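worker-3 :: picked Eukaryotic translation initiation factor 2-alpha kinase 3
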Amino acid sequence: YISRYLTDFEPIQCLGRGGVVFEAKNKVDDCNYAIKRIRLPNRELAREKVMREVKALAKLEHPGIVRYFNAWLEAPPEKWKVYLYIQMQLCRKENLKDWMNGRCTIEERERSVCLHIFLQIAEAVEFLHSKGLMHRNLKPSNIFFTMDDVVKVGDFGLVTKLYMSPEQIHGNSYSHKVDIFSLGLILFELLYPFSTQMERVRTLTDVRNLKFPPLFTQKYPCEYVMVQDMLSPSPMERPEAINIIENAVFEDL
Ligand SMILES: Cc1cc(NC(=O)[C@H](O)c2cccc(F)c2)ccc1-c1cn(C)c2ncnc(N)c12
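worker-3 :: tokens ->
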């Protein structure tokens, strides 16, 4: 037995860890892809549950969704069981976190470029919600850029907490509102740069509890009302993905 992945791609490196994610140039077409290797569940309703998802995911086409290419199953003989591969468009190694941690002044955070980036993330989330799907992984380490500076939501589907909503932590991610919450923090962190890791944690932890820096509440007064809405502590209160994109602040960017 020889595995499909090993014959057809020469691996470059590992990009992710949690399933594993590799970089690998396909030999036929000579382009480098992001490849997610999941070890599958051993049960026969846990297997089939997943395989109904890869079917629904592979149908997704949107500008904020990393471009899909292929999926295939393998089952090799271990030396001492059944891995699923997903070939996805490779993305720039510099994610949203990197981008933010490299621009720490109000000046390097232009109000125009920031709202632009955020809208794309919001529009991608609108799409997924309208398809009856939810992200549940919105956070800067997992918001990406394409070679051509297009923003993409990161990995989701196929089954830190500072960007998780409360219910998500102690509950069952119950509603698609958990994504509205995540967007709130992300919008703030874009418009209010940090100096130190401590500052970031202390201030986000506070903004989870609606304790905002007054300098922010002054500087961006509209944005403040949005981030408040998006954080409304009773889930059912928060806006819908659609409502956020239709907010006045997004007009003639
Ligand atoms: C591994 C990975 C997977 C996805 N999967 C999906 O969106 C989503 O599962 C999906 C599947 C199928 C169709 C469909 F529409 C959507 C998105 C992003 C990355 C990614 C992570 N890391 C660390 C990366 N590093 C460089 N490039 C990268 N693509 C990545």
